[PDB]
Amino acid sequence: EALSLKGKRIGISTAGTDHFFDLQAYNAQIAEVKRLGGEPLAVDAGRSDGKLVAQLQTLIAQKPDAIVQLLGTLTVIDPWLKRARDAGIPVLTIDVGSSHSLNNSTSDNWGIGKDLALQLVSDIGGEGNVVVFNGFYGVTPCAIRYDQLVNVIKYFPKVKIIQPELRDVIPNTVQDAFAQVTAILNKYPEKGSIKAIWSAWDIPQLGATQALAAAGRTEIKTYGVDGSPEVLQLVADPASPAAADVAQQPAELGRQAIQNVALLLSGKTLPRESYVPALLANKQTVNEVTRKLG
Numbered sequence: 001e002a003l004s005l006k007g008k009r010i011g012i013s014t015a016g017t018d019h020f021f022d023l024q025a026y027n028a029q030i031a032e033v034k035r036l037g038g039e040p041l042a043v044d045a046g047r048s049d050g051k052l053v054a055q056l057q058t059l060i061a062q063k064p065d066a067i068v069q070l071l072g073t074l075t076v077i078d079p080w081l082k083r084a085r086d087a088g089i090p091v092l093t094i095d096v097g098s099s100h101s102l103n104n105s106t107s108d109n110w111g112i113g114k115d116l117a118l119q120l121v122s123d124i125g126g127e128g129n130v131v132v133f134n135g136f137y138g139v140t141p142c143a144i145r146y147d148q149l150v151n152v153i154k155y156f157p158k159v160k161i162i163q164p165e166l167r168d169v170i171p172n173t174v175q176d177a178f179a180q181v182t183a184i185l186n187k188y189p190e191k192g193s194i195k196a197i198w199s200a201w202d203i204p205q206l207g208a209t210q211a212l213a214a215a216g217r218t219e220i221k222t223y224g225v226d227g228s229p230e231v232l233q234l235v236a237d238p239a240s241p242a243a244a245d246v247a248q249q250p251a252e253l254g255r256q257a258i259q260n261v262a263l264l265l266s267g268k269t270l271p272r273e274s275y276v277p278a279l280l281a282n283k284q285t286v287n288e289v290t291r292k293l294g
């Protein structure tokens, strides 16, 4: 029969909503629970680990029909996802590869990370130095994306990751990424001594790209993931060093998660992960990518 959540209460917990991917996935879950007739209990951690734990505890005390957790550092949330299951509460996730989740809605990040890395390598001629932002390695999709970069360049050994990897941050992501790249360009002033800057998601990319323009170092190419509109439009600008951004579908991911909650409560067994396609946008493909998202 048609899916429904009538009479159900669904806990919806996100690590934050402070940029495109997170806001989209969060809102679309809330929307979808409502559209299926369920009652969402939606809690935003504002990117505090303390608030994230505290709101999951409260959702647990509420004994909703399911909890969906969006993003977060796996070691931070895992004890609470376990507690929820132990309390009798079905747990699903978005971008969290937990043993305690019944189903993780996520892009196929092996595909994403490999595709981005191969683009990067091809773009720089198989040779040169790469500045890497790797500040969210504790977050499943970012860990996978980083692992794939490492693994792709392993087989193109004239490609090197510059040492001290940088740590991107949230919030203040753009201003911080701008400052870090600005300071690193001053360590490596010689044209050609950096060829790319990689990030696991595209808001640090945005900071990076800006710092390149400001510094007069646009020979350097930038790379990222999410397809936030503000960054896609940089990729589309020939005069921008933003070279590639793998677009994700966060509203689709959020709807899928809730679709999968309904399926679970109706009795069906879920696959452990459910992959939503992603689309690599480079300077040639961004138009057809941007159009498929709008």
Ligand SMILES: OC[C@@H](O)[C@@H](O)[C@@H](O)[C@@H](O)CO
Residues within 6 Å of the ligand: 021, 022, 071, 072, 095, 136, 139, 141, 142, 200, 201, 202, 225, 226, 248
């Ligand atoms: O954990 C940071 C970041 O990767 C996420 O907030 C989001 O932007 C997506 O890239 C996750 O699929």
Ligand SMILES: [Cl-]
Residues within 6 Å of the ligand: 212, 213, 215, 216, 217, 218, 219
């Ligand atoms: Cl320039």
